[PDB]
Design a protein around this ligand. Structure first.
Ligand SMILES: Cc1cc(C(=O)N2CCN(C)CC2)cs1
Ligand SMILES: Cc1cc(C(=O)N2CCN(C)CC2)cs1
Lengths: 300, 237
């Protein structure tokens, strides 16, 4: 189990760690989060009490370094940093652990929620979507736009998700216009799976990462990307059977975890009704269709 | 964006544009089978592609053989339309290619956009006007060439005959739409109006009769009467 210490908490803030959330008062004796499960990526995120504008946070994997949080009064935010002196770090964490200055990652033993939301998400792929190579962790916030959004303005601070566009030369083979537009299997299996992503694990990883940025930061371009990647599968007549089964599990846990009160802005009515009721895969998402109909029957 | 009453003079400016109407591409007769079920029999169709400024009508005849062995024909027809319009554009010199294509039905937007991806600078636009181009098959010479075709064929006509020698393209399009609206509301009455006087003929190279300016004003008045009438005979007013 690993630890992310905090130098201090000078400003009142809600801190979230994956699907968990807690409140830290201004100048409260808070010095970080312990017992974080090894083996998964994690996200630590922030919403200031004084300006709920800008949710922001950091994707990281404790196997890749020793990371801590330190408020910066000039830039006005909690910053993740790496500590290279391993002895300095282990001593610091131990002293704080000895003084009970940290909140415990509260993982119920039965609970596989985080694994099920991050199964295919890898730090190395996150770092290609979020480009900042001098750090081992990746900053995301509510306002960051995607490469495709910039095509429709600072490229260094963009989310470089894979561009999906159903009315594009990449998506449509000359002479198969009607075929490829109505059945997207060519675009899914040859262009995206075989050509760009290489395998379905990497595709699912980007899909899961896009969902999590939409949920935790309200990132609109991420929501667009999540729905586009769903729709490309549902709109393909020919999809490997193992991908459909896994997609159903992925989406089930995403819909299960979504806050009930954010459904109106995080769920696209058109995509979900098409995918569940009109698409080629309308009958292949039994778990997802059941939880959607019992939790958000209004949307449908 | 969508073409409507507010931006109507744009049709007669000097940017090349085409209207595309697909309402006569897939045409059927519905009939009973020996077993008492219902079946369709396709008949020849046409794409109506029109330059409203010049009157040029690229009439692509759709022969029934194009539907043989195909499913979901009403959907295929929109894509066949888009395929043929794209082929037409590619066949034209660059300086004759349109800068906008206006479709008369919104269901043509995605088929045409996808077929025209090679031409990102050509705008594909819908319209809020309820244009009467379905009635093109009430023009006898156009119906004749469509029905006689034994293979796919493109015929080129000017739908304004020689009107542009005497009137503007705004006025010519207004006359065309009035004639076609009349033919759509009551084909027989409209056709009686146009031919009742045997001394006014249709030139071999024309679609409509050779009315003098004064006769066109009478004719046009008679078509407006018909349209208001039938609007009474219809709604009882
Ligand atoms: C890691 C942690 C999670 C929580 C947690 O669930 N609570 C936050 C505080 N109360 C107000 C709601 C419930 C506290 S510390
Ligand atoms: C391109 C098209 C031309 C016409 C037409 O009526 N004529 C105009 C005079 N010459 C120049 C061409 C033939 C119909 S379609």
């Amino acid at each position: 189990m690993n630890t992310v210490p905090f130098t201090s908490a000078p400003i009142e803030v809600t801190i979230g760690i994956d699907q968990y959330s807690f409140n830290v008062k201004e100048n409260q004796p808070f010095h970080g989060i312990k017992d974080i499960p090894i083996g998964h990526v994690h996200v630590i995120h922030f919403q200031h009490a004084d300006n709920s504008s800008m949710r922001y946070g950091y994707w990281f994997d404790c196997r890749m370094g020793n990371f801590y949080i330190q408020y910066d009064p000039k830039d006005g935010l909690y910053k993740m940093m790496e500590e290279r002196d391993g002895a300095k770090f282990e001593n610091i964490v131990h002293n704080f652990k000895e003084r009970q200055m940290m909140v415990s990652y509260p993982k119920i033993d039965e609970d596989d929620t985080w694994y099920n939301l991050t199964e295919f998400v890898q730090m190395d792929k996150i770092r290609k979507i979020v480009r900042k190579d001098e750090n081992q962790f990746s900053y995301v916030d509510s306002s960051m736009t995607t490469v495709q959004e910039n095509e429709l303005s600072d490229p260094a601070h963009s989310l470089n998700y894979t561009v999906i566009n159903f009315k594009s030369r990449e998506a449509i083979r000359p002479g198969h216009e009607m075929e490829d537009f109505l059945d997207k299997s060519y675009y899914l299996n040859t262009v995206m799976l075989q050509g760009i992503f290489k395998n379905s694990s990497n595709y699912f990883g980007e899909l899961q990462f896009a969902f999590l940025n939409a949920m935790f930061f309200g990132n609109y371009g991420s929501s667009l990307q999540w729905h586009a990647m769903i729709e490309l599968i549902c709109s393909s007549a020919t999809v490997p059977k193992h991908m459909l089964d896994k997609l159903d599990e992925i989406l089930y846990y995403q819909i299960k975890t979504l806050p009930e009160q954010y459904s109106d802005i995080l769920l696209n009515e058109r995509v979900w009704n098409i995918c569940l009721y009109s698409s080629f895969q309308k009958n292949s998402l039994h778990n997802t269709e059941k939880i959607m109909e019992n939790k958000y029957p209004e949307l449908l | 964006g969508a073409m409507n009453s507010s931006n109507y003079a744009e049709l007669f400016n000097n940017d090349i544009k085409l209207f595309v109407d697909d309402t006569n591409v897939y045409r059927v007769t519905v009939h009973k089978t020996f077993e008492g079920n219902v079946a369709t029999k396709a008949i020849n169709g046409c794409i109506f592609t029109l330059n409203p400024k010049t009157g040029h009508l690229f009439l692509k005849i759709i022969h029934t053989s194009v539907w043989a062995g195909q499913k979901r024909l009403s959907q295929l027809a929109k894509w066949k339309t888009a395929e043929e319009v794209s082929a037409l554009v590619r066949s034209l010199p660059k300086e004759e290619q349109p800068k906008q294509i206006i479709v008369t039905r919104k269901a043509m937007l995605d088929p045409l956009e996808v077929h025209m991806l090679d031409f990102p600078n050509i705008a594909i636009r819908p319209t809020e006007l309820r244009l009467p181009f379905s009635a093109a098959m009430s023009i006898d010479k156009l119906s004749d060439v469509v029905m006689k075709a034994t293979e796919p064929q493109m015929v080129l006509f000017n739908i304004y005959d020689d009107w542009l020698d005497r009137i503007s393209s705004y006025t010519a399009f207004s006359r065309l739409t009035l004639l076609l609206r009349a033919l759509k509301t009551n084909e027989e009455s409209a056709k009686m109006i146009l031919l009742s006087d045997p001394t006014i003929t249709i030139k071999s190279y024309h679609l409509w009769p050779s009315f003098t300016d004064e006769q066109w004003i009478t004719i046009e008045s008679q078509m407006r009467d018909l349209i208001l009438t039938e609007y009474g005979r219809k709604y009882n007013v």
